[PDB]
Design an enzyme around this catalytic site. Sequence first.
Site, mmCIF file in Angstrom:
data_model
loop_
_atom_site.group_PDB
_atom_site.id
_atom_site.type_symbol
_atom_site.label_atom_id
_atom_site.label_comp_id
_atom_site.label_asym_id
_atom_site.label_seq_id
_atom_site.Cartn_x
_atom_site.Cartn_y
_atom_site.Cartn_z
ATOM 1 N N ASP A 1 -10.126 72.928 -27.296
ATOM 2 C CA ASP A 1 -11.199 73.302 -27.752
ATOM 3 C C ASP A 1 -11.801 74.700 -27.452
ATOM 4 O OD1 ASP A 1 -14.406 72.854 -27.405
ATOM 5 O OD2 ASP A 1 -13.527 71.275 -28.850
ATOM 6 N N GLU A 2 -12.633 75.128 -28.435
ATOM 7 C CA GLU A 2 -13.282 76.323 -28.047
ATOM 8 C C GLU A 2 -13.822 76.481 -26.730
ATOM 9 O OE1 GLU A 2 -14.739 74.292 -30.051
ATOM 10 O OE2 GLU A 2 -16.782 74.367 -30.154
ATOM 11 N N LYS B 1 -18.582 66.331 -42.742
ATOM 12 C CA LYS B 1 -19.767 66.891 -41.996
ATOM 13 C C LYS B 1 -20.518 68.331 -42.218
ATOM 14 C CE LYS B 1 -19.519 66.677 -37.684
ATOM 15 N NZ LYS B 1 -18.764 67.213 -36.382
ATOM 16 N N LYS C 1 -4.865 71.457 -30.794
ATOM 17 C CA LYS C 1 -5.494 72.518 -30.045
ATOM 18 C C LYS C 1 -6.385 72.517 -28.800
ATOM 19 C CE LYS C 1 -8.891 74.204 -32.356
ATOM 20 N NZ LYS C 1 -9.982 73.552 -31.581
ATOM 21 N N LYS D 1 -9.281 64.978 -27.611
ATOM 22 C CA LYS D 1 -10.324 64.288 -27.354
ATOM 23 C C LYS D 1 -9.962 63.648 -26.212
ATOM 24 C CE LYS D 1 -12.641 65.991 -31.095
ATOM 25 N NZ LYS D 1 -11.524 65.850 -32.138
ATOM 26 N N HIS E 1 -11.039 80.953 -33.586
ATOM 27 C CA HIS E 1 -12.205 79.641 -33.665
ATOM 28 C C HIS E 1 -13.537 80.350 -33.822
ATOM 29 C CE1 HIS E 1 -14.413 76.182 -32.991
ATOM 30 N NE2 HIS E 1 -13.429 75.700 -33.070
ATOM 31 N N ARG E 2 -14.241 79.950 -34.990
ATOM 32 C CA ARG E 2 -15.365 80.812 -35.437
ATOM 33 C C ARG E 2 -16.772 80.292 -34.390
ATOM 34 N NH1 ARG E 2 -17.467 79.203 -41.218
ATOM 35 N NH2 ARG E 2 -16.703 77.307 -41.220
#
Lengths: 138, 138, 138, 448, 448, 448
Positions: free
Chosen positions: D186-187, D316, D184, D158, D276-277
Site C-alpha cells: 500500500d502507499e 469508485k 503491491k 488487504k 503511486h499517485r
Amino acid sequence: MRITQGTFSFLPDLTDEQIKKQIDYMISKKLAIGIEYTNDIHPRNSFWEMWGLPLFEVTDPAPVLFEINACRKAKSNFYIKVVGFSSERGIESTIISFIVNRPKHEPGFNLIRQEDKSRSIKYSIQAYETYKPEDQRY
Amino acid sequence: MRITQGTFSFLPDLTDEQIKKQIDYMISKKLAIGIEYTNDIHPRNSFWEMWGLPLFEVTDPAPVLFEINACRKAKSNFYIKVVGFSSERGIESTIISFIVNRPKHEPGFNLIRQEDKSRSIKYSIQAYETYKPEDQRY
Amino acid sequence: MRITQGTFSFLPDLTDEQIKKQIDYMISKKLAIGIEYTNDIHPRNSFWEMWGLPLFEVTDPAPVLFEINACRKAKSNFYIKVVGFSSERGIESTIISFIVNRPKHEPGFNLIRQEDKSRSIKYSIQAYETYKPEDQRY
Amino acid sequence: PYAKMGYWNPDYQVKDTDVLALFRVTPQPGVDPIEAAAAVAGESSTATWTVVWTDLLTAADLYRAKAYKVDQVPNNPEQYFAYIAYELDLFEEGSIANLTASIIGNVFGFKAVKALRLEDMRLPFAYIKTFQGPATGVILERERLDKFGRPLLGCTTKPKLGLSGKNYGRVVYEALKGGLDFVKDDENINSQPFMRWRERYLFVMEAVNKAAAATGEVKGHYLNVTAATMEEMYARAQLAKELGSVIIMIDLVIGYTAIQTMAKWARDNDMILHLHRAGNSTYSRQKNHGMNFRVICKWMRMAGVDHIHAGTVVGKLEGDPIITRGFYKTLLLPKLERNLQEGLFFDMDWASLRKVMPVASGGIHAGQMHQLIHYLGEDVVLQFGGGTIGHPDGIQSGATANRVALEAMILARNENRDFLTEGPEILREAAKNCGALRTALDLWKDIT
Amino acid sequence: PYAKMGYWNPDYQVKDTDVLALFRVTPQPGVDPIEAAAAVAGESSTATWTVVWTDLLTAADLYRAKAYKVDQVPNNPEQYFAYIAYELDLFEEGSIANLTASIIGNVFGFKAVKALRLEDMRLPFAYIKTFQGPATGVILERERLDKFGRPLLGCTTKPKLGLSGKNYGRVVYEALKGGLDFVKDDENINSQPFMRWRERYLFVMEAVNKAAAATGEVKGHYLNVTAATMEEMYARAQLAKELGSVIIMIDLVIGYTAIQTMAKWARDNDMILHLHRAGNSTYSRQKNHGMNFRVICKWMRMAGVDHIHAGTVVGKLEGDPIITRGFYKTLLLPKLERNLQEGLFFDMDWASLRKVMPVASGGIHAGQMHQLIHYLGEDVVLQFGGGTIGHPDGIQSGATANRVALEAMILARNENRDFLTEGPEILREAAKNCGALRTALDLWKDIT
Amino acid sequence: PYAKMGYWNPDYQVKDTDVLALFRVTPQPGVDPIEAAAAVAGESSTATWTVVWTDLLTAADLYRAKAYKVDQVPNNPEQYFAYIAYELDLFEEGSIANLTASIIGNVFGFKAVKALRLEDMRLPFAYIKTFQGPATGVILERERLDKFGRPLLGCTTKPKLGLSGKNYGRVVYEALKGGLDFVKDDENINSQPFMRWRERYLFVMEAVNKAAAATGEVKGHYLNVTAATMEEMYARAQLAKELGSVIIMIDLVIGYTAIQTMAKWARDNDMILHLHRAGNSTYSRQKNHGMNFRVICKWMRMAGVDHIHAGTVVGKLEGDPIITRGFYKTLLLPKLERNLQEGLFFDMDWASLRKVMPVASGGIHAGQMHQLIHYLGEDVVLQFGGGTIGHPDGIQSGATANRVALEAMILARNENRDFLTEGPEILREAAKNCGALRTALDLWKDIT
C-alpha cells in the site's frame, strides 16, 4: 565609513532621551541589560568586553544611563553597545543590541583574497584599526 | 501442474477453430508469425527453439495452421507456442504469445535456496524435466 | 530422520485426544486456527499450503478435528500442522504451531557446500524428496 | 499594466522550441480577459512592479512569457483559455523542478484572477529529448515478464496495514500463485512500529519465488521504498535489488527531485518503477483551480516512472471516459494529436521516449471486464482489491477468477466478437468452466 | 457502509498520542454528513469494499481511522468540519512522506464528497519529537548574524533571469552594501543556457564578502541549490558551503523527501535553509478543496526549513490579517492555542522544536512599514522587489530607504508611540534626514 | 541549602513528558530526609555552591530537577524513597549515555547521604519514542526461527575456554543436533592466544549448518563479537553476517555507546543481538547502594538488544520470585503497572517498542522444568550448562533430555494440568519414553 551592526545604526546616533526610552522598553520586557565595548569592530567578534555585570530586575532607567555614561567616559574611543537578554524559555538569548557610542572616525576593513583551487578564493576581513595594538586604536 | 506462460493459459487449451481465429487477428494486425518450441519450461528461458522461419505477409490462416500441426507431430511432447511480432515503430517486439501444445504431464519446478548473508537467500528454480537430457524429457 | 519443526516434535506423535486438548487451549486463548500442509520440509519454507481458511471464533474442538482428519485423508503423505494466530496488539503473529501428520519415512536433507573466498563456504540445504516432483514425494 | 508591458502579443509566432502552457483562467469580476491572460504571463516570467534599468543589461524580451491567444470556454462565459509561450532557454535541461517552479510558481496566488487551472502543456521536442523518460517502459517491461497481448493484473495487500512480515508474505504468495501478475505494498506501508521494512522484503521475496516455482511465470511484488530522506530510500531500493525483485514502488509525495533520482536509479539497475499517485486529487480534482492530471502524466513520463495510476472509467471513480482516454494517450502514444474533447489542446511529439504503463484501480471487479477492456485497452495493469482477497473460496480463487475473466475477454476481442454488447454472456460461458468465476459473478452482480 | 463499519464513533476518546485531522467536507447532494465523515476516515485507513478474513489476523481496530465529531460550518450550511483521529502507530517516525500519504492519500478523489479541504492537524507531542525541526531556527539564526530586535530585509534579484554571472553579482553587491541583510536567487534561477550555476555562486560570494567589508555586517545571498536529482543538489549545496555562504535556498517543488534530506544537510553543515514556497497556491488557495497553508507550515517546521514565505497582510496578497496571524503563530510559537478565527482548530505543543522565520514579499514598499510591523511583528524577513532595485537614485539608495524606514518604525514602536496611527508621520520625520527615503515616499504614495 | 534553593517542591505537578527517578536514599545520621532528597535533585541538575548571575540568562527553573515526594521505606526506618522529576528537554534524544550521565552522575559520591540506590525510572512516552528499541524483538525472532509457543533452549560451551576451533565446533554440533535451539560463546571467549576468533566462526558455521541439515530446524550459535575497539567489533560482526549466522552476542562491559552502535547494526543487518550481562552485579546486588537491575532492563530495551540474562527463580540464584517477575514484565509487556511488591514504582507505557527475550541460566536442570515454566513463562531462553554437556550418555543425549522435559511440561500446561503440583510426575511419564531423560532425572534428583 559607518559600521552598521546594531538595531538602529541606520538612524542618527541616539540622544540620551532616545536611549532612555529604549531602556524603558527593555524593562517592560523584563530583560537583563548589559553594556559591552570593543575596538575590534569585526562582525564575527562575538565577545565584546563587558562593562561590569548585566543589570537584572532594573526598575528605573537611571542606573543604566549612569553606567552607559560612565562607560563612555572611560572608553570614549571604543564602540559601546547596550544589549538586552531575554530569559524567556525558547528564546534565552539577545533580543535587542544597539550602538550608544562610536569612535570619531571609522576607517573600515581590509579585504584579503587568498587564491585557492580553480577560481575559488578564501576571504578574510580585517579592521584597519586592528593592525594597531589595542591601546593605540582610534 | 499447468504452466501459465502465454496469453490464454488460464483458459482450456485452444481448439484448432480457436487458433485459427487468433491467426486472423494477427493477420489483421499485420504481424510476422513465429512458431517456437521448447522442453526447458523455465520462465527465463527466453529463446525457445524456432520451427522454421517466421511467416511474413500471411493472408490466409491455412499455411500457419499447417506448420502448427507439422510442429505438433514432430514435437508432440514439447511446449509449442505461437508468437506475433509487430514491426510498428516504437513497438518492434512481441505483442501476443500463446501456447498451442503442452506435454501430457508437467511435473513443475524445484526451488533451491542458497543461504547467503544474514537472512538473505539466493534462489534458483529448475524444471524437473531438465534434470534429464533433452531427448528424454516428458 | 524425524523433522523437529513444531512445538511438540520431541514428544511422540500426538493422539487425537491430545490434539483436542491443544484446540481447547487455543480456543481459550481466542486464537484463529489454521491447518497447513507441505511436502517441501525445508526450515525456511515459510509458506506451507493452506487447507481452507483459518477458523475464527471456534467454540468447540469438533469442527477443527474434522478438518484435521479431512486434511490427513486427502494429504496423508504430507506434513500437516496446526497453527494458532493471536491478534493481540503487539503480538499479531503465530503463538503455537505443531505437527499432526508426518509422512511414513523422512529421508532428510542434502548439505551443499559451495567454496567461496579464502576458507568461507556458502551452504544450501535441500530436502531429498524435493529432488522429485510434488506429486511424487513420500 | 501587463497588456501594455509586452506580455500580450496576439501576433507572436510560436516556435517549435517554445514551451507552451494552456491555463483555464477565471478573471476577477471587473478585469478584462486579455489583462488576466497577460497578468499570468507576466507574473510567471519577468514580473517586476516598477521600472528596472538592470533589464536593459539583458536581451529582455527573451525572458518574457507571452500570452498570445485567449478564447472564452465553450460553455462557461466566465472562463477563458489562455495560451502562453516560454522560450526554451528559460529552463534547466532534464529538470522537472525547474519546469514546475517556472510554470506554476506565483500565478495561482495572484489576485486579479479568481481561479486558475493549468490544463495542458506543449513540451517541445528539443526539451523532451533532455529527459530520460521511463526507466523501463511498456515494451521492455513485457519482454522482461514475457507477458504479451493482455493487460497485467495486480492487487494491493488487504488489510493495508497490520499483518506481521510472515502473515504479509502469506497473502502475497496466495495472490501470485492464484494468477495475479503482481501484488503491491500500500502507499501507506513504509516502515512502522507494527512492521519494519526489512522483514517485509525478506518474507515477500520468498513468497514471490515460491509462486514463480508454482506457476512457471515471472512474478513480482511492488516493494514500497518510500522513505523520509534520499539515503533511506536508496537503502530500501538497494535491498529490493539485492534480493532480485523485478519491481519497486514509490509514492508521488516523495516529490519530484526524489522521483527523478529514483528513475535514474531504476534505469541503471534494471528495476521496474511503479509510481503511486497518492495526494494528486488535492489539485487535480476541481475543474476551476489547480493542475489537470494530464499535465502530471506528461511530467512523470518525462521523469521516467514505468507505471502510474491513470483512472478507471467504471467503479469508485466513474470519471469521463473521453478525458480518461486522453490520459492513456499521453502515457502511451508516440505522438499526441490535439483533440478538444479529450482535453488535449496541443499536438505533441514524444521524441521516442518510452511508454508508461497506466494502472486502473478503485472498486473494480471481474463482472466489468468487458467495459474495462473496451475503455482501457490492452496496455494497462488492472488492480483488484477486495475483488481478490475476499473471495469466499480463498485468495487463490479470487485471483483465478480475475485471470480467467480477463483472458476470456481478450480471446473474445481477438475473435472479433462484439464484446461490449456480448460481454456478460462471454463471462457466463467462461464461468461454466470455472467455479471460482461463477462464485465471483454471483457475488458481485448487484454491486452499487 | 462506513458509519456501520466502525469508522464513525462519536464516543471515541482522543488520546495525547493520536494524530488528529480537521477536514472541511462538502458531501454529495444526497449523502449524510456523518456518512461523508466516516467515508473520509474509512477511505484513508482500512478502506476495503467486501469483507476480508485477513483483518482478523491483526488488531484491526487500531488501524482504523475514526471520525469522532462533525459540525456544520458557521456560515455555510452545505459544509461540515469533520474531526478524525489516527493511531500514532500508523506512521513512520520522522517521515513527512509517510504522514502525507497516510492523511491525504485517496480521499480527495472520493465521489461521495463533492469537495474536501484539509484545514488543520494536531500532531501529537510524541510524533513531533521524532523530527529534527529547523536546521537553524530563528534564535541561532540571529546569533549567527548578530542581528536582533528587528525584522531582517531582503529582495530578489531583478531581472529574475538573464544577467551574466558578473552583472548578477553587481546587483547583489549594490543591494547588500545599501543596507539589505540578504539578496536572493529567484525560485526560477537554477542553471540555464544563459547562465550556469557555478559562475553565479563564485561572483556572488565576491559580492557578499565585498559588502561585509563595506558595512561591517554579516551579509548573505540565498544561493538556489534546486536541481533535478539529489546528487546534483548536493553538488550545489557543497559549493555554497565550500565558499562560506551563510545561507542557501530550495524550492518547495523539489518535494518532501528532498527537503528533509537537505534539512539534515543544513543542520550538519551550519547553513541557513530558506524554503521558497513556489507552486503552493494550486492546492492552498480555494476555500472548498485541497490543503490549507497552515498544515504546510506545520509539516515544514517539522521537516526543518529555517524560513518560509508566509504572507503579507497588505499588498499583492491582501489576505485575511487574522488567518495570516495564525500562520505566523504556527511558525513561531512554542504552543498553539485553538482559536477558531485564526483557523487554529487544535491546541498543539511544539515540543521545543526550533522556530521558523516567516518571510513576507509581494508588492510591499517602505510606505507600509507601520502596517507591516503592526501585522507581521518583529521576527520576519521583509522582502522588497522593485521596491529596492528601481529606486531612481540607484540600488544602494533603494536599499537604504527600506532600512531607514524599518529602523525608524521599530524605534517608534519601542518608544510606545501609537505607530499604526502615527506611522505616516513617523515615516515623514525619518525622511527629513534621509533623501533616499523622501524620494521613495514621493514615488510610492498613490500605489494602487 | 537545597530545600530552600527550589529543589524540593511537594507541590510540583508531574507532566507526561517528565523523566522520573525513584531513589532509595540513606541520609547521613543527622540530615533530614527532605534535605537528603533535595540534595540528590540539586546535585544532579543545577548544583552550584555559591550564587551565579549567569543562571539568569536562562529559564533557570526548567533545568532544575525537583524532589517532589519522600516516603520512609516500609520496613526500614533509616531509608526513604525519593521521587525526582527532570524536564524532558534536559536530555539528548536516543542517547543512553546522556540519560545515564544526567541521572546517576554525581549523586552516588555525595556526603550528606550514606548510601543511595536508583530503583526505578519512569521514561516518558515521548522520550521512549526517540529510541530504536530491540533490533529484532521476540515476535520477529520467533518468526525468523519458526519456533512458537515454547521457551527456546541453549547452553554455553564447556569448557568455556581452551578447545581448538575444530574441537569447539564439535561441541556446537552435538548440542544443536541433540535438540538445543542455540549454543553460545562464553562472555570470556573473544580472541586469545589459544584460539583466535576467525577459525572459531568458520568451524562454528559448519557445525550450525550441519545440525540444521540433521534436524530440519533453523539453528544458531551466539558468536561473541566483543572486542577492544568499535572497528574491531564491526569486523567480527561483519564476518558473522557474511557467513549467514542468525545471531551474535555482545558483553555488557563494552559499554552503552558501543551497544547502541551494535543495536543499530543488528537492526540494519537482520541479526539477533544477545546481550550478556557480565559485571552487572557489582552495582545491582546490594540492596542499599547502586542501581537496581530493572532500570538496566529499561535502558537495554530502549537501546535495542534482543535477549538479556534476567534471572532464574530456582538454582544458583534463587532470587525473589516476585522481583524477578518484575524484570520479565519490564522486558516483555507493552505497559507496566505500578506494583510495589514487584518493585515497579511507576506506570509506564512502552510506546510499542519491541519486546526483549529474557534468558534464564545458572545451575538449572531438567528436574526443575515445572517451576521454570511456572515462574518464567513461555517467552524465555532456558540456558543449560553442565546440565547438557556432562550427560553420561553424551552431549546429544544431554540436549534431548532437556528438550523432551520442556515440551512435555508445555504440553501439560496447555492441557490445563496443575503442572506445578503434578510436575515431578509429568517428568516421570515423559522419562518413561525417554531414556536420556530418565538418566538425567536419576542423576540430578538430590541436586543441592
